């Protein structure tokens, strides 16, 4: 449960400083690669935190929350004040439906900021099961919000919290406030996309996701998230096209194949479903390049 399942035959076990190789693969809009690189820095230098953080932060973007949490926990193990790790933790547990671990992470994100640590003096009606923890850091983030009316990362955090309680009404208001401020943050355009999609407006969502891919043309979550909206609107041709681009860009892959298996299913292609068990995205022709 503790350590990372490192991928064997890592070509960066042979490269002198691979941190820099990866950091610019992330610059080259190529997550699958940049994850391998950082996987080496973590194996070569266990004690270096910006390696575990870049690793986690990247795996989350590469649609693998599993490995992302394992990685961020080691980055946190090394520096428990690291607001970017905690920000990311909250997002990942929210996605993974681990509520208590999410609230804890948001709270920790806030209280680690020196400009808010003044708030550590703390003390039926509104939603959540896991209730004291949620009433707390909802208060805490509003107090933070009436200190600094236009902190984008404060809205984005409220957005995260309101997704956990299934209030995509308020989540979308805040995450809309958060982009606008920072209209070129891909992380933030996706968050809007997902909030909207979860709150049953996939139409709008698809807009929000396109702005994200305009900024980071190789962001694998999002490609996946676009499949999820197209699937929810029962436009399965489109979902299918989008998932393939997402599977391709992911590199083996995941339960990503399980999702593709149920599309081809409802689509009435017993063939194709039969040959998903080969690694190969190769045969699946509607896109080329």
């Amino acid at each position: 449960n503790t350590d990372y399942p490192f991928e064997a035959n890592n070509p960066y076990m042979y490269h002198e400083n691979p941190m820099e190789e990866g950091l610019s693969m992330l610059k080259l809009a190529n997550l699958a690669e940049a994850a391998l690189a950082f996987e080496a820095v973590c194996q070569k230098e266990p004690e270096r935190e910006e390696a575990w953080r870049s690793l986690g932060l990247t795996q989350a973007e590469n649609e693998k929350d599993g490995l992302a949490i394992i990685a961020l926990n080691h980055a946190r193990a090394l520096d428990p004040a690291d607001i970017a790790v905690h920000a990311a933790l909250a997002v990942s547990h929210t996605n993974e439906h681990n509520a208590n671990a999410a609230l804890a992470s948001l709270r920790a994100w806030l209280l680690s900021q020196p400009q808010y640590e003044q708030l550590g003096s703390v003390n039926e009606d509104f939603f959540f099961a896991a209730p004291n923890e949620y009433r707390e850091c909802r208060t805490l983030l509003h107090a933070a919000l009436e200190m600094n009316p236009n902190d984008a990362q404060l809205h984005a955090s409220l957005g995260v919290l309101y997704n956990l309680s299934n209030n995509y009404d308020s989540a979308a208001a805040n995450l809309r406030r958060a982009v606008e401020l920072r209209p070129d943050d891909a992380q933030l355009w996706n968050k809007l996309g997902a909030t909207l999609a979860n709150g049953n407006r996939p139409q709008e969502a698809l807009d929000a996701y396109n702005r994200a891919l305009d900024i980071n043309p190789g962001y694998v979550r999002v490609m996946y998230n676009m499949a999820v909206s197209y699937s929810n609107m029962s436009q399965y041709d489109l979902a299918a096209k989008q998932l393939v681009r997402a599977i391709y860009m992911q590199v083996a892959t995941r339960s990503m194949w399980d999702f593709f298996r149920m599309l081809l299913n409802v689509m009435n292609r017993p063939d194709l479903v039969e040959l998903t068990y080969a690694q190969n995205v190769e045969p699946f022709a509607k896109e080329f390049g």
Binding site: T94, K191, A194, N198, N200, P202, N225, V228, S231, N232
Partner: peptide, 7 residues
């Protein structure tokens, strides 16, 4: 329509 989107 019932699948979950990711933040």
């Amino acid at each position: 329509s019932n699948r979950w989107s990711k933040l």
